[PDB]
């Protein structure tokens, strides 16, 4: 996800390349006998050759670096000040926090830390517009799928035949039950119109549970909700002796 | 920078090297002893080791109690200041002080002759004190200044201070434990 969002123009959801270069890579991909390791090599090649471009040739839009701003948190560095001449984009962006600076005094000292943050709704609604012809350049088999299914909004649940009645019930059953429980409470509680901060904190907690539902080896969790016992994720039972 | 270099290894004149040196560092300008430039010969810096505080000139020895005291008596006859340590408790008992078994301290005895010091053949040194004797050993050496002083609190508002002299040596006393066990078996 972060690779692709660093290879995409936010303004117009286009790949940042010149037409001659685009044709050059298209010739490279035309070459017969494409091999998996060659796929990896050309993934690195395109990443390097496209990261050099800082403006969108199609619409002239300047886009910043996208960086993981926190554990399971991504931010876009578009609105970044520089040691060189101040960019017009940040000049117009920073001045828009006047009302917040007036209301709260902690805005002004960190008004420059405001950047373009990315979230599943924003991202998904950006990739749903992607032109099809860009997909092959992104090393996506269009028959295999499309970028919108890459961000998940619906989950399977494995059949009973792989989970015994007693692991009392298997961790998966507990994981699924707690996830749905959170889903019900968060929907009715947001329907209750509660405070912002803790609604999004519930969102983050939801995301965290989903991550742990796949992989039980993550160790970046803060102390005050860190797990106190070992549990088996999918990777745990697929890997190991 | 020169690249072509032809080195030499035939025996050179050592005196030529010594004379080159001489001409390079022995052109003395020490005559520049002007007002801002005097140095008091007593006012030099000092070495890391006290025993050899002689890095620039104008141009400790082993000892034993018997030898030091014999030297003191023989080669000189003026007065010296000695610092010495006694065992925690003296052989005596409190002089009608009405006592916990408080230790008999030097501070708790009357003036006058208290004992004798005896030096035996082979240089062994002992202190005779009443019915018992205490061993004496030269202490750890010292090299930094130690000054004996007397403080006079002549008044609650002010007093007077007079120096008495410096301390040169240390002495250490000890009980003769093996003698005690031999005198009183257990």
């Amino acid at each position: 996800v972060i690779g692709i969002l660093q290879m995409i123009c936010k303004t117009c959801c286009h790949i940042m390349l010149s037409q001659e270069e685009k044709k050059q890579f298209l010739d490279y991909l035309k070459r017969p006998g494409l091999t998996y390791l060659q796929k990896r090599g050309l993934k690195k090649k395109i990443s390097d050759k496209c990261r050099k471009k800082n403006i969108c040739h199609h619409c002239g839009a300047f886009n910043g670096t996208v960086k993981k701003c926190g554990l399971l948190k991504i931010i876009h560095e578009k609105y970044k000040t520089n040691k060189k001449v101040v960019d017009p984009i940040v000049s117009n962006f920073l001045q828009s926090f006047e009302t917040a600076i007036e209301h709260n005094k902690e805005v002004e000292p960190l008004l420059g830390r405001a950047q373009e943050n990315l979230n599943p709704l924003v991202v998904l609604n950006l990739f749903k517009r992607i032109p099809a012809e860009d997909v092959p350049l992104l090393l996506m088999n269009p028959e295999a799928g499309k970028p919108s299914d890459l961000i998940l909004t619906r989950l399977l649940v494995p059949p009973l035949c792989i989970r015994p009645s007693v692991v009392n019930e298997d961790d998966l059953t507990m994981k699924l039950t707690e996830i749905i429980f959170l889903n019900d409470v968060i929907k009715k509680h947001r329907i209750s119109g509660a405070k912002t901060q803790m609604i999004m904190e519930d969102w983050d907690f939801l995301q965290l549970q989903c991550a742990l539902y796949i992989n039980s080896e993550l160790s970046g969790i803060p102390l005050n909700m860190a797990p106190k016992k070992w549990t088996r994720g999918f990777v745990q039972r697929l890997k190991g002796k | 920078r020169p690249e072509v270099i032809q080195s030499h290894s035939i025996f050179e004149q050592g005196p030529a090297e010594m004379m080159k040196k001489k001409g390079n560092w022995d052109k003395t300008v020490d005559v520049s002893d002007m007002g801002p430039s005097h140095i008091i010969n007593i006012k030099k810096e000092k070495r890391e080791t006290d025993e050899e505080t002689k890095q620039i000139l104008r141009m400790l020895p082993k000892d034993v109690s018997v030898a030091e005291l014999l030297r003191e008596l023989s080669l000189t006859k003026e007065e010296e200041l000695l610092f010495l340590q006694l065992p925690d408790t003296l052989p005596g008992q409190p002089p009608t002080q009405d006592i916990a078994e408080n230790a008999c301290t030097l501070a708790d005895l009357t003036e006058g002759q208290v004992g004798k010091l005896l030096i035996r053949k082979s240089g062994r040194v002992q202190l005779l004190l009443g019915k018992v004797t205490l061993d004496v050993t030269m202490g750890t050496a010292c090299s930094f200044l130690q000054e004996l002083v007397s403080v006079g609190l002549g008044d609650s508002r002010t007093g007077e201070m007079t120096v008495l002299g410096h301390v040169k040596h240390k002495l250490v006393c000890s009980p003769d434990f093996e003698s005690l066990l031999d005198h009183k078996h257990r």
Partner: protein, 209 residues
């Protein structure tokens, strides 16, 4: 000093000339067995000799198939070759109207010219060797079996024999010291004759990628 450098100059001349012969360009046998004293006779002592010119050679031509195809050999002097020097070399080359040329560096060469050394022109290409490497001709080393280049017909017959597609053969890297020695381009083929533990020999083929 001035004797070891002259020895180096004679040795590098000998090895480079051997390489020219091996690649099949025009060369005179009497110079192949040129002695160090002969080099002193034909070229003065180090202090009297000028590195950037004295050794420059262009006599070799592709007489093997076209005597009119001249080739040029250059020997810069500065420890790291600079852009201006290669610009002088390229203008001299254009004046001489040749395709390629060889360059011998003492210690290195500048990074901007490193980049330029791949894109001067499609019709012109340059090949750089280290003085340190050239001091010995690897072809004579005990651990290097004989390599031989062959014509397209030979590879045609070979691929016909085993019923192979060209991309199935074992590979050899382009940057390989021997590949550089032979100056072969990508897509050629090389025969190897490994000296057996006995009088026999094993033949194997490698492709240059």
């Amino acid at each position: 000093d001035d004797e070891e450098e002259t020895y180096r100059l004679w040795k590098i001349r000998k090895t480079i000339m051997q390489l020219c012969h091996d690649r099949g360009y025009l060369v005179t046998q009497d110079e192949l067995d040129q002695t160090l004293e002969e080099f002193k006779a034909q070229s003065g002592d180090k202090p009297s000799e000028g590195r950037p010119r004295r050794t420059d050679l262009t006599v070799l031509v592709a007489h093997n198939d076209d005597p009119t195809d001249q080739m040029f050999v250059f020997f810069p002097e500065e420890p790291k070759v600079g852009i201006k020097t290669i610009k002088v070399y390229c203008q001299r080359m254009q004046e001489e109207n040749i395709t390629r040329a060889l360059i011998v560096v003492q210690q290195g060469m500048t990074p901007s010219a490193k980049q330029s050394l791949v894109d001067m022109a499609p019709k012109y290409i340059l090949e750089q060797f280290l003085q340190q490497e050239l001091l010995i001709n690897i072809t004579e080393h005990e651990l290097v079996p004989e390599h031989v280049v062959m014509t397209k017909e030979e590879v045609t017959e070979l691929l016909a024999r085993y019923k192979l597609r060209e991309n199935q053969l074992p590979r050899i890297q382009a940057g390989d010291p021997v590949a550089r020695y032979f100056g072969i381009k990508r897509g050629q083929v090389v025969k190897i004759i490994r000296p057996s533990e006995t009088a026999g020999r094993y033949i194997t083929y490698r492709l240059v990628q």
